[PDB]
Ligand binder design. Structure first.
Ligand SMILES: [Ca+2]
Length: 123
């Protein structure tokens, strides 16, 4: 959910405050997302946006009726490695994977400050 995602990013990027650094970045990092991603990090966010959107259409999440920020799945972080919990059911596990993928993606791409707080005209 939101706090787990934030903790997962920190796990991979220990010097960051993801709620400050990765919010409002490019066209997809933060509320909504549309247009063409401005860079690779923006693509990470785009992918993660699509993943949560896919989660919602899942039979398992739908047999229940969650919210990608109301789902208390479990994960751990050891040595900057994120492990989604075996205990997570199919829905929780799919969402946790979306987040773990996003976090690793964030840790693998350049950060371009010029793209921080981008006017959505460019999207
Ligand atoms: Ca977004």
């Amino acid at each position: 959910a939101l706090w787990q995602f934030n903790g997962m990013i920190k796990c991979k990027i220990p010097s960051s405050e993801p709620l400050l650094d990765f919010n409002n970045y490019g066209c997809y990092c933060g509320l909504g997302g549309s247009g063409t991603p401005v860079d690779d990090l923006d693509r990470c966010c785009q992918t993660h946006d699509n993943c949560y959107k896919q989660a919602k259409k899942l039979d398992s999440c739908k047999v229940l009726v969650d919210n990608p920020y109301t789902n208390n799945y479990s994960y751990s972080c050891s040595n900057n490695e994120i492990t989604c919990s075996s205990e997570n059911n199919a829905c929780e596990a799919f969402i946790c994977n979306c987040a773990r993928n996003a976090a690793i993606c964030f840790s693998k791409v350049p950060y371009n400050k010029e793209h921080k707080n981008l006017d959505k005209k460019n999207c």
